[PDB]
Amino acid sequence: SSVILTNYMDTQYYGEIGIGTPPQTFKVVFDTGSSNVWVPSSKCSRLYTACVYHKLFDASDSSSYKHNGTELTLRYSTGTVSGFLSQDIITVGGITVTQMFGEVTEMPALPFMLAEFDGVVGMGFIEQAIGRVTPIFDNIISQGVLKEDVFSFYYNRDSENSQSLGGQIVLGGSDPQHYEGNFHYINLIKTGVWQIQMKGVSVGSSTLLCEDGCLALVDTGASYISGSTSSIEKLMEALGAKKRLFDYVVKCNEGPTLPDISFHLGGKEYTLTSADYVFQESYSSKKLCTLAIHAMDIPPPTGPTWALGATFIRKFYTEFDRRNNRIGFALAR
Ligand SMILES: CCc1nc(N)nc(N)c1-c1ccc2c(c1)N(CCCOC)C(=O)C(C)(C)O2
Numbered sequence: 001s002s003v004i005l006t007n008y009m010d011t012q013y014y015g016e017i018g019i020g021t022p023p024q025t026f027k028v029v030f031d032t033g034s035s036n037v038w039v040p041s042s043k044c045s046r047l048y049t050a051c052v053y054h055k056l057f058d059a060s061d062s063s064s065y066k067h068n069g070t071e072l073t074l075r076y077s078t079g080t081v082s083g084f085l086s087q088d089i090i091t092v093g094g095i096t097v098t099q100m101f102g103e104v105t106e107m108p109a110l111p112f113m114l115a116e117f118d119g120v121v122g123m124g125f126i127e128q129a130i131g132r133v134t135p136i137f138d139n140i141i142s143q144g145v146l147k148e149d150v151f152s153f154y155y156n157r158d159s160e161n162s163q164s165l166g167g168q169i170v171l172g173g174s175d176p177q178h179y180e181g182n183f184h185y186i187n188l189i190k191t192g193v194w195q196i197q198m199k200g201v202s203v204g205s206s207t208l209l210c211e212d213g214c215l216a217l218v219d220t221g222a223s224y225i226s227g228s229t230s231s232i233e234k235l236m237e238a239l240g241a242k243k244r245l246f247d248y249v250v251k252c253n254e255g256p257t258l259p260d261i262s263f264h265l266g267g268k269e270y271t272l273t274s275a276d277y278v279f280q281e282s283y284s285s286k287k288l289c290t291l292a293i294h295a296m297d298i299p300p301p302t303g304p305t306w307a308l309g310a311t312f313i314r315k316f317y318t319e320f321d322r323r324n325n326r327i328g329f330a331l332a333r
């Protein structure tokens, strides 16, 4: 199965899923950086303005609903949500599965008021599942219907003319329509996390970063490519970028000239061009242009680690292989 995704400003990719009977629809990010499923709850206080602006699941209108009520809290690098657990049938592009998910009752304004999506479908391993809840992908696998134990991500580049798909996720394989060349696989450091060994990061012609090795989390639920505050400070220093509050900028007229940035993964260099990491919204020397690379310190056990988000996946079609515990990259078509 494949789910069509919508691209919002190159920072938010989400698709649709139905929960309950009749199906209550929700926009959700398919996140390889987490393992739980959650959507805003009708029990969410309207004092949380974010709940006023999103679709809310109402168990009272679902005949297939299954109570549980176990409380849980989901911690993301840029925000937290609280709620309780519930069970119901979830429709994911053709596949129907009974799933345990979280009904969020606490959705902080910053950042959720800025989310185009309603919730999250975690594609991570159960090992990282808060509350030891069986992940939706594991449950789908249990049905023995997927042609293969893998799922793929295609994140397109933004577009001013809704007619071009913003992206697509395939359950059970990869769509040859959106990649060329052959996949180059990299074995997972450890099962339980979509993290791999990164052999080095280079800026221009000189591997000035991640020498001796480092970690790379391949996060489909993250907007950018991130590294420890230390690493980025060094990286951004080379690009001549000014550190702001939440991002790093560069004078727009300088964006096009910025050097290539490479990532040494599984014995192949994955190179990004300025056009790939800079939000070139102007050429003016009187305007600032944001970089699609940020500083973000991920805490243990997962961190310290670099994170390969949408900035990376836009260029490289990504396949996640549960069967062989490996990640695959290929030039996105
Ligand atoms: C998905 C859930 C998620 N998963 C992971 N592993 N990391 C995150 N930082 C987020 C996460 C949380 C809140 C967010 C966003 C992401 N994103 C990025 C969406 C990425 O889409 C591919 C946002 O834009 C705003 C609204 C700030 O709020």
Ligand SMILES: *[C@@H]1O[C@H](CO)[C@@H](O)[C@H](O)[C@H]1NC(C)=O
Pocket (backbone or CB within 6 Å): 067, 068, 069, 070, 085
């Ligand atoms: C919620 O589901 C878990 C999963 O097995 C179960 O152990 C727990 O008792 C459930 N909570 C209740 C009381 O419904």
